[PDB]
Amino acid sequence: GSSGSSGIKQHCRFCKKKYSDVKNLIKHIRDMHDPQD
Numbered sequence: 545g546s547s548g549s550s551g552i553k554q555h556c557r558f559c560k561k562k563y564s565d566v567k568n569l570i571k572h573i574r575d576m577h578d579p580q581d
C-alpha cells in the first residue's frame with residue numbers, strides 16, 4: 545500500500561517496555577518513573 549498507520553508504536557526510555565501509542569506510554573512514565581526534575 546502507498547500509505548498506512550506504520551511506525552506509530554513507542555518505547556520506555558527507562559525500563560525498555562513497549563506501547564502501541566504515546567499516551568499509554570506517558571501514563572506508564574508518570575506511574576512508574578515520574579521524571580519531574
Ligand SMILES: [Zn+2]
Binds near residue numbers: 558561576577
Ligand atoms: Zn518504563
